[PDB]
Design a protein around this ligand. Structure first.
Ligand SMILES: Cc1cncc2cccc(S(=O)(=O)N3CCCNC[C@@H]3C)c12
Ligand SMILES: Cc1cncc2cccc(S(=O)(=O)N3CCCNC[C@@H]3C)c12
Lengths: 341, 20
């Protein structure tokens, strides 16, 4: 009857999601309501700033997207997906979109601020995580993917760079740039090279199974300290991914290796998460036998690593980036393209 | 060691997603 409680939790979560999916929150703040403090991150799409909402004094991470760059990069549809989805979802290991708005030049997404840093920085410093440490994080992603997939969402960008550590040592998935709501197959080449399932590389038409492959990549990297498929250039990584070979460090437990062989499975009829038992082939695997799935959800397990608190607006867990100034044009750009934002 | 190969490689920093 564990399974019946999960079903009804998920049915209730779908009614909650669909209301917001159908009637999206829109224009819920303005730039002028925020004091900009420091640039705390950038990707190849825009830039993220620590801001302070002046009316409440709360700190947030504000993603700024230049509409003209989104259009030139052909990321219109993905950006509409990203915001529509993130404003609709509600799960403990998903970063919260607090406000969104746009002006003549930019789109803005204001999310909860996580001063503890990304998993990526902690992993590189420490080298690798212990099996128990990796398992605590992996558990949160298993639940998160069970949630997302139940809403017909594919995530498509799992990696330590997209996982932030909150003040209890739990994680939040924090970038929804390539998330999509789709029934059936989708075809876009997207993701991060090290994490791409073979059916993406091969232009084959794919589904949520790509997320579970990616979870295998994450668990491997967390526990080894390096990815299962690495090379100096992407085409060399793809050749390795599509070969069907993986080698495991000698310190990997036999249960870990068996899990990973089932997730890093080129054969879609055999990949864990994509069989008739679904996510339960994972949650019941021997590597997960000590994981109390409900206690993880409720955040009652003691975290293996709590980042040291230094203030709600401290930025010492992020690198320094060059400051650039936000320029807002007196003419509206790309109005029609982003009307639903 | 494989780990020494990784940390000397071209892709140890934050990795971007792929485009178009
Ligand atoms: C999500 C989406 C959402 N809204 C409108 C869309 C219009 C055209 C294409 C898409 S789309 O599916 O994003 N899309 C284009 C990107 C590459 N893959 C082909 C596919 C048809 C839309
Ligand atoms: C530092 C940070 C801190 N707090 C919240 C955040 C919410 C979303 C993104 C970030 S972010 O890390 O700046 N960020 C986006 C930039 C590209 N890298 C992926 C990563 C998730 C936040």
């Amino acid at each position: 009857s564990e399974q019946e409680s999960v079903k009804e939790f998920l049915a209730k979560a779908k009614e909650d999601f669909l209301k917001k999916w159908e009637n999206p929150a829109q224009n819920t703040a303005h730039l002028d309501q925020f004091e900009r403090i420091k640039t705390i991150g950038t990707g190849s799409f825009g830039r993220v700033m620590l801001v302070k909402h002046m009316e409440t004094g709360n700190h947030y991470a504000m993603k700024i997207l230049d509409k003209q760059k989104v259009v030139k990069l052909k990321q219109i549809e993905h950006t509409l997906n990203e915001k529509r989805i993130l404003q609709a979802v509600n799960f403990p290991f998903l970063v919260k979109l607090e406000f969104s708005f746009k002006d003549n030049s930019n789109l803005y997404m204001v999310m909860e601020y996580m001063p503890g840093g990304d998993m990526f920085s902690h992993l590189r410093r420490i080298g690798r995580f212990s099996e128990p440490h990796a398992r605590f994080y992996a558990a949160q992603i298993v639940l998160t993917f069970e949630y997302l997939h139940s809403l017909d969402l594919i995530y498509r960008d799992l990696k330590p760079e997209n996982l932030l550590i909150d003040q209890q040592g739990y994680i939040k998935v924090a970038d929804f740039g390539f998330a999509k709501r789709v029934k059936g197959r989708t075809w876009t080449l997207c993701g991060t090279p090290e994490y791409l399932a073979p059916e993406i590389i091969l232009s084959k038409g794919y589904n949520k199974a790509v997320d579970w492959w990616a979870l295998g990549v994450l668990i491997y990297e967390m526990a080894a300290g390096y990815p299962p498929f690495f090379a100096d250039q992407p085409i060399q990584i793809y050749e390795k991914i599509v070969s069907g070979k993986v080698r495991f460090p000698s310190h990997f437990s036999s249960d870990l290796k068996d899990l990973l062989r089932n997730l890093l499975q080129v054969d879609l009829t055999k990949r864990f998460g994509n069989l008739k038992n679904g996510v339960n082939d994972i949650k019941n695997h021997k590597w997960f036998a000590t994981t109390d799935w409900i206690a993880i959800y409720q955040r009652k397990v003691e975290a293996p690593f709590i980042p040291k608190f230094k203030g709600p607006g401290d930025t010492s867990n992020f690198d320094d980036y060059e400051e650039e100034e936000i320029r807002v044009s007196i003419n509206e750009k790309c109005g029609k393209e982003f009307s639903e934002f | 060691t494989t780990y020494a190969d990784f940390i000397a490689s071209g892709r140890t920093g934050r990795r971007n997603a792929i485009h178009d």
